[PDB]
Write an enzyme that holds these catalytic residues in place. Structure first.
Site, PDB file in Angstrom:
ATOM      1  N   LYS A   1       0.350  -1.037  -0.216  1.00 44.80           N
ATOM      2  CA  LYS A   1       0.036   0.285   0.245  1.00 44.80           C
ATOM      3  C   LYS A   1       0.686   1.008  -0.062  1.00 44.80           C
ATOM      4  O   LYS A   1       0.181   2.259  -0.141  1.00 44.80           O
ATOM      5  CB  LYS A   1      -0.942   0.165   1.112  1.00 44.80           C
ATOM      6  CG  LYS A   1      -1.591  -1.361   1.111  1.00 44.80           C
ATOM      7  CD  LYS A   1      -2.532  -0.870  -0.024  1.00 44.80           C
ATOM      8  CE  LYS A   1      -3.715  -1.852  -0.027  1.00 44.80           C
ATOM      9  NZ  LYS A   1      -4.379  -2.397  -1.306  1.00 44.80           N
TER      10      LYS A   1
ATOM     11  N   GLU B   1      -6.305  -1.978 -10.932  1.00 41.48           N
ATOM     12  CA  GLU B   1      -7.071  -2.234 -11.753  1.00 41.48           C
ATOM     13  C   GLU B   1      -7.091  -0.293 -11.536  1.00 41.48           C
ATOM     14  O   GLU B   1      -9.102   0.443 -12.002  1.00 41.48           O
ATOM     15  CB  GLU B   1      -8.252  -3.240 -12.385  1.00 41.48           C
ATOM     16  CG  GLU B   1      -7.762  -4.084 -12.510  1.00 41.48           C
ATOM     17  CD  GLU B   1      -9.522  -5.383 -11.631  1.00 41.48           C
ATOM     18  OE1 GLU B   1     -10.375  -5.116 -11.520  1.00 41.48           O
ATOM     19  OE2 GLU B   1      -8.862  -6.350 -12.995  1.00 41.48           O
TER      20      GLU B   1
ATOM     21  N   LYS C   1       1.178   5.402  -4.970  1.00 41.79           N
ATOM     22  CA  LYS C   1       1.575   3.861  -5.362  1.00 41.79           C
ATOM     23  C   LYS C   1       2.529   3.818  -6.356  1.00 41.79           C
ATOM     24  O   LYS C   1       3.712   3.667  -6.438  1.00 41.79           O
ATOM     25  CB  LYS C   1       0.819   2.962  -5.535  1.00 41.79           C
ATOM     26  CG  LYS C   1       0.308   2.625  -4.050  1.00 41.79           C
ATOM     27  CD  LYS C   1      -0.900   1.969  -4.482  1.00 41.79           C
ATOM     28  CE  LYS C   1      -1.591   1.622  -3.078  1.00 41.79           C
ATOM     29  NZ  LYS C   1      -3.755   0.873  -3.498  1.00 41.79           N
TER      30      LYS C   1
HETATM   31  C1  LIG Z   1      -6.275  -7.093 -10.751  1.00 35.88           C
HETATM   32  C2  LIG Z   1      -5.967  -6.462  -9.232  1.00 35.88           C
HETATM   33  C3  LIG Z   1      -6.379  -5.621  -9.261  1.00 35.88           C
HETATM   34  C4  LIG Z   1      -6.672  -5.007  -8.197  1.00 35.88           C
HETATM   35  N1  LIG Z   1      -6.012  -3.614  -7.702  1.00 35.88           N
HETATM   36  C5  LIG Z   1      -6.136  -3.122  -6.960  1.00 35.88           C
HETATM   37  C6  LIG Z   1      -6.313  -1.759  -6.579  1.00 35.88           C
HETATM   38  O1  LIG Z   1      -6.958  -0.759  -7.723  1.00 35.88           O
HETATM   39  N2  LIG Z   1      -6.084  -1.144  -5.564  1.00 35.88           N
HETATM   40  C7  LIG Z   1      -5.806  -1.546  -4.365  1.00 35.88           C
HETATM   41  O2  LIG Z   1      -4.924  -0.528  -3.299  1.00 35.88           O
HETATM   42  N3  LIG Z   1      -4.550  -2.945  -4.387  1.00 35.88           N
HETATM   43  C8  LIG Z   1      -5.650  -3.150  -5.343  1.00 35.88           C
HETATM   44  N4  LIG Z   1      -5.102  -4.482  -5.919  1.00 35.88           N
HETATM   45  C9  LIG Z   1      -4.428  -5.135  -4.838  1.00 35.88           C
HETATM   46  C10 LIG Z   1      -5.641  -6.160  -4.007  1.00 35.88           C
HETATM   47  O3  LIG Z   1      -6.911  -6.020  -3.247  1.00 35.88           O
HETATM   48  C11 LIG Z   1      -5.380  -7.952  -3.495  1.00 35.88           C
HETATM   49  O4  LIG Z   1      -4.474  -8.401  -4.073  1.00 35.88           O
HETATM   50  C12 LIG Z   1      -5.913  -8.414  -2.616  1.00 35.88           C
HETATM   51  O5  LIG Z   1      -6.916  -7.565  -1.664  1.00 35.88           O
HETATM   52  C13 LIG Z   1      -4.709  -8.231  -0.821  1.00 35.88           C
HETATM   53  O6  LIG Z   1      -4.583 -10.126  -0.970  1.00 35.88           O
HETATM   54  P1  LIG Z   1      -2.733  -9.573  -1.168  1.00 35.88           P
HETATM   55  O7  LIG Z   1      -2.591  -9.260  -0.500  1.00 35.88           O
HETATM   56  O8  LIG Z   1      -2.882 -11.261  -1.119  1.00 35.88           O
HETATM   57  O9  LIG Z   1      -2.215  -9.586  -2.987  1.00 35.88           O
HETATM   58  C14 LIG Z   1      -5.359  -5.942  -7.132  1.00 35.88           C
HETATM   59  C15 LIG Z   1      -5.182  -6.891  -7.135  1.00 35.88           C
HETATM   60  C16 LIG Z   1      -5.682  -7.456  -8.439  1.00 35.88           C
HETATM   61  C17 LIG Z   1      -5.681  -9.226  -8.556  1.00 35.88           C
HETATM   62  O1  LIG Z   2      -8.339  -4.362  -4.703  1.00 37.26           O
HETATM   63  C1  LIG Z   2      -9.077  -3.239  -4.635  1.00 37.26           C
HETATM   64  O2  LIG Z   2      -8.532  -2.931  -3.022  1.00 37.26           O
HETATM   65  C2  LIG Z   2      -9.090  -2.368  -5.103  1.00 37.26           C
HETATM   66  C3  LIG Z   2      -9.619  -2.985  -6.821  1.00 37.26           C
HETATM   67  C4  LIG Z   2     -10.414  -2.443  -7.553  1.00 37.26           C
HETATM   68  C5  LIG Z   2     -10.565  -0.832  -7.177  1.00 37.26           C
HETATM   69  N1  LIG Z   2      -9.893  -0.294  -6.660  1.00 37.26           N
HETATM   70  C6  LIG Z   2      -9.635  -1.418  -5.716  1.00 37.26           C
END
Ligand SMILES: Cc1cc2nc3c(=O)[nH]c(=O)nc-3n(C[C@H](O)[C@H](O)[C@H](O)COP(=O)(O)O)c2cc1C
Ligand SMILES: O=C(O)c1cccnc1
Ligand SMILES: Cc1cc2nc3c(=O)[nH]c(=O)nc-3n(C[C@H](O)[C@H](O)[C@H](O)COP(=O)(O)O)c2cc1C
Ligand SMILES: O=C(O)c1cccnc1
Lengths: 216, 216
Positions: free
Chosen positions: B13, B164, B73
């Site tokens: 983050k 995304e 980020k």
């Molecule tokens: C395709 C995709 C899009 C994501 N978009 C965002 C985003 O825009 N902002 C964000 O803070 N995290 C985003 N994430 C992170 C997801 O919230 C995250 O993978 C999951 O909740 C937290 O698990 P992790 O720590 O195992 O990745 C995205 C994840 C994926 C796979």
């Molecule tokens: O995974 C997230 O936090 C996320 C995914 C798409 C758009 N905004 C946030």
């Protein structure tokens, strides 16, 4: 190192049926599936893991006819994973995700829990109401899991191949996926390659970076 | 071990702006991008890798309005990768793929080359003419590359987050993607997390396997 793995892995064309995953490897591949990331931790997926001959035979029904060359891969591998995506966005699933995040201890307060749920709902609503692409969006997350899985299984020392060459309507009916709200997208047999795997000794081929990649 | 990697990686983050990729790590992430698998080795993708302040500022224009949380980020990471998918299937690309496979030495004969090209064209035609889903099919392959990339970068000991949450229309216009025949899908900042990354110390949360996984 992981780059060696990425440079050495290949799509297996033939599996050795006598070589089974260890019990520990079987558990590890299930961990890889579970722990993939996804947008909003939506986890919009189901996995069918076939390890018995009966189970693998059921998956291989989908390769009958036009996909006959996919059949041997499906039958001869130790384990076969079918990656399914959710087809409709159900609010029950979104509640399930946030209730699990809460149980795992990700929220300091009820207000942080409520905000997480509000964010997830907002994103889901954008895809279904504004973009009309929620099925596509969920399928993309499953393809992301597939990419994670293929590299992971290679790093475990296992052979694999991703297969889009199967009949999804047959696979859906065989496992009753339509009524459960899923569709099959990719089948990934996992095991060890045999001496007939012609692809194991061929050079890897990719377009050069000057074609696909811009630095700024 | 790769399972440790998968269980320990997280979506960063907050990045430490003073901590840059080594020269060798910068090359390794580009190799990971190049060597992802794809259906028919179609490689229907382009990558923008921004490492300069100017470059990263251009990418961060797309984190405006609803997406402001993505801006830090994008600016603070060492490198930012934009994953783009081809929007139209051009026959020039398919010829390029098979000519590269030939140059790399994958074909014993001209007949094996012709058969590979014929197979690739058949598959491409099924998606464009029969399913009318070629854009979706190409985007799925890019999401597969993203999943490969996220696990790979974690195995290199780098932090990342898939995004995304950005404005694709702005990013497309900033780099002139529409005219080149691409669309931006996912932005992945890569670097090292800072002490403000609240997600680094929170437990990982996933649905249990008894919900998501069936053994047969
Ligand atoms: C395709 C995709 C899009 C994501 N978009 C965002 C985003 O825009 N902002 C964000 O803070 N995290 C985003 N994430 C992170 C997801 O919230 C995250 O993978 C999951 O909740 C937290 O698990 P992790 O720590 O195992 O990745 C995205 C994840 C994926 C796979
Ligand atoms: O995974 C997230 O936090 C996320 C995914 C798409 C758009 N905004 C946030
Ligand atoms: C989504 C996907 C679908 C694939 N489907 C098939 C398939 O049906 N049959 C097959 O033999 N190979 C299949 N492949 C393997 C590809 O041809 C292979 O990944 C590509 O040629 C690159 O070679 P590599 O995997 O050895 O690096 C598939 C690959 C992907 C990523
Ligand atoms: O990449 C392949 O070999 C492939 C992809 C889709 C369908 N059949 C084969």
């Amino acid at each position: 190192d992981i780059i060696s793995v990425a440079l050495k892995r290949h799509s297996t064309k033939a599996f050795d049926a006598s070589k089974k995953l260890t019990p520990e490897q079987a558990e590890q591949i299930k961990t890889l599936l579970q722990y993939s990331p996804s947008s909003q931790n939506s986890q919009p997926w189901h996995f069918i893991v076939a390890s018995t001959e009966e189970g693998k035979a059921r998956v291989a029904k989908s390769a009958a006819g036009n996909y006959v060359f996919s059949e041997r891969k499906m039958l001869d591998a130790s384990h076969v994973v079918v990656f399914c995506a959710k087809t409709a966005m159900d609010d029950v699933w979104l509640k399930l995700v946030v209730d699990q995040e809460d149980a795992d201890g990700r929220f300091a307060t009820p207000e942080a829990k409520a905000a997480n749920d509000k964010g997830r709902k907002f994103t889901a609503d954008v895809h279904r109401k504004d973009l009309h692409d929620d099925a596509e969006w969920m399928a993309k997350q499953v393809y992301l899991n597939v990419g994670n899985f293929l590299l992971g299984v290679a790093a475990l020392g296992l052979d694999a191949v991703p297969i889009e060459g199967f009949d999804a309507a047959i696979l859906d009916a065989e496992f009753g996926l339509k009524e459960k709200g899923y569709t099959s997208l990719v089948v990934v047999p996992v095991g060890h390659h045999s001496v007939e795997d012609f692809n194991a000794t061929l050079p890897k081929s990719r377009l050069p970076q000057n074609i696909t990649l811009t630095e700024v």
